[PDB]
């Protein structure tokens, strides 16, 4: 689906956490509800959602063109520490990534 745009980071590591079947389910869930994941304050509207069989995905939903940006995926307690500087970096990663599209 053209609805989901994977970051290079997301694409590298997705298969560690999700089978194709698990991933398509995740995509169907978001399509049904774009606001599914919880907002991460300080990041300009990035959202974080939990996934079982767990792991976490951070995405941005562009409502204008109905499109999801999948920034990253990781396991709980693996990279789960989030400070103020890390929130800023997610923004920079995002704002840089989303300007051209």
């Amino acid at each position, epitope marked *: 689906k053209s609805v989901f745009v994977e*970051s290079t*980071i997301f694409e*590298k*590591y997705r*298969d*560690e956490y999700l089978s194709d079947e698990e991933y398509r389910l995740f995509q169907a869930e978001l399509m049904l509800n774009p606001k599914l994941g919880d907002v991460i304050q300080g990041t300009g509207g990035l959202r974080k959602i939990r996934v079982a069989s767990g792991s976490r995905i951070i995405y941005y939903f562009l409502d204008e063109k109905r499109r999801f940006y999948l920034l990253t995926i990781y396991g709980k307690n*693996e*990279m789960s520490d989030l400070n103020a500087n*890390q929130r800023k*970096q997610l923004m920079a990663f995002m704002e840089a990534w989303r300007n051209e599209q």
Partner: nanobody
Amino acid sequence: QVQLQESGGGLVQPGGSLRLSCAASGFTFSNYAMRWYRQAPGEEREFVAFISSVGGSTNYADSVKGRFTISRDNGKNTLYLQMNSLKPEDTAVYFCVARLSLISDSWGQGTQVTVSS
């Protein structure tokens, strides 16, 4: 500069063993989970093994479980992959991989493993 430098690759008989090493430099190695990935000619790169920052937790691709062991030395800042009962299908370039944050990482240039009679 963050650097990962793999070594220990070789051309080895099926059934044999190898031990890959990855010498990490330029970052606080012990704070980061480490991974091995591999890539065969013409194929996509694939996950091989994962080890937690302290090294107590590990997990493996189904295809190598029970044959490969991932380990780390947090004083030498070195990551290892012990590979036993090697098969032709294990032939690939093996990569040391550090995820440095949620959105950044570093990959070694890789070491070549070839399993052939």
